[PDB]
Design a binder for this molecule. Structure first.
Ligand SMILES: C1=C/N(CCN2CCOCC2)CCNc2ccn3ncc(c3n2)-c2cccc(c2)O/1
Ligand code: NA
Length: 329
């Protein structure tokens, strides 16, 4: 019933181990460790009058959708009829009050020195400033940064199957659309499991992992519903979102607006198909693999992913793809 200080989320040792791993106009993303386990910390300023990274801060009302959707997708790992671990776990959410911790500014500076930042140094916040702090499971490294790091197109097959299954399960349970599943929002982490498990409308199956587990992240533009209450980001009056160029990613925003007639409250699971097509397109055109297809068996995998690319836009949802597409048989 009141905000907490930063130290409540980030006690001294946890704060000392923070390293910055990402950013956006929204704010900052740090990795840290507690109980021997990495976690990702996403920090968003809210409710204040300062521009931050050139944009106005969201209100608490405007941040609730991301919080709600993060929780619902996290909970899918523990459900029965519609179960998937292909989203990202949500450990906690806090409303914090205070100026930015100097130890986080230290991490911010290190990232700016080594990778470079597009953001303002977050050193201008007063002691009444509010933030949302989301703590997530650490999901690994994004697909874009793994452009040159994957073994083969067999790995790409696994990734696309994992993504399609997770989206299908969320469609079935929550009438979910991600709406921004660019390759920076697909994370990859090593697993020793040979196969991954999901359940779609009570029917369980498995996916060969190729040694990686996929997590879909970042629900800032996503949509879902429960008992007819729809949670979403109304981008109907956004200009900039629909005028990008130089990557198929930017066409997906326009294609979604075409599909939904600019009515973002509606359910159009074809948007998940569009994102999966964009990701397949990435796999075939921008990813480069350590081992190219040699064997009959691998060459068949390549042909099957090409087939997927040229046919998948004729499916109505991730659910339709998973259940009917030959790629997953
Ligand atoms: C922010 C994503 N960032 C990218 C921001 N984009 C903003 C738009 O422009 C491109 C960058 C960090 C990505 N890396 C990363 C790494 C490990 N992890 N492990 C978990 C996340 C997580 N995130 C994560 C979970 C939920 C939401 C989330 C991150 O939200
Ligand atoms: Na996951």
């Amino acid at each position: 019933k009141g905000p907490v200080p930063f130290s409540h989320c980030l006690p001294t040792e946890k704060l000392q181990r923070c390293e910055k791993i990402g950013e956006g106009v929204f704010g900052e993303v740090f990795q840290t460790i507690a109980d021997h386990t990495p976690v990702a910390i996403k920090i968003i300023a809210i409710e204040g009058p300062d521009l931050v990274n050139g944009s106005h801060q969201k209100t608490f009302e405007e941040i609730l959708p991301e919080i709600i959707i993060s929780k619902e997708l996290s909970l899918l790992s523990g459900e029965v009829c519609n179960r998937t671990e292909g989203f990202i776990g949500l450990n906690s959410v806090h409303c914090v009050q205070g100026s930015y911790p100097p130890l986080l500014l230290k991490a911010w500076d290190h990232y700016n020195s080594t990778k470079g930042s597009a953001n303002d140094r977050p050193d201008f916040f007063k002691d009444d400033q509010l933030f949302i702090v989301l703590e997530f499971e650490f999901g690994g490294i994004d697909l874009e940064q793994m452009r040159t790091k994957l073994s083969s197109l067999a790995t790409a097959k696994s990734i696309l199957h994992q993504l399609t299954a997770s989206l299908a399960v969320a469609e079935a349970s929550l009438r979910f659309e991600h709406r921004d599943l660019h390759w920076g929002n697909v994370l990859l982490k090593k697993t020793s499991l040979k196969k991954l498990h999901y359940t779609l409308n009570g029917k369980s199956s498995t996916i060969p992992s190729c040694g990686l587990q996929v997590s879909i992240i970042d629900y800032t533009l996503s949509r879902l519903e429960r008992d007819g209450i729809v949670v979403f980001c109304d981008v109907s009056m956004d200009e900039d979102l629909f005028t990008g160029d130089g990557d198929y990613q930017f066409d997906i925003y326009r294609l979604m607006k075409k599909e939904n007639n600019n009515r973002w409250g509606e359910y159009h699971p074809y948007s998940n198909v569009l994102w999966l097509h964009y990701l397949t397109d990435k796999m075939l055109k921008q990813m480069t693999f350590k081992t190219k297809c040699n064997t009959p068996a691998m060459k068949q995998i390549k042909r099957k992913i090409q087939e997927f690319h040229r046919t998948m836009l004729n499916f109505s949802s991730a659910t339709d793809l998973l259940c009917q597409h030959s790629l997953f048989k």
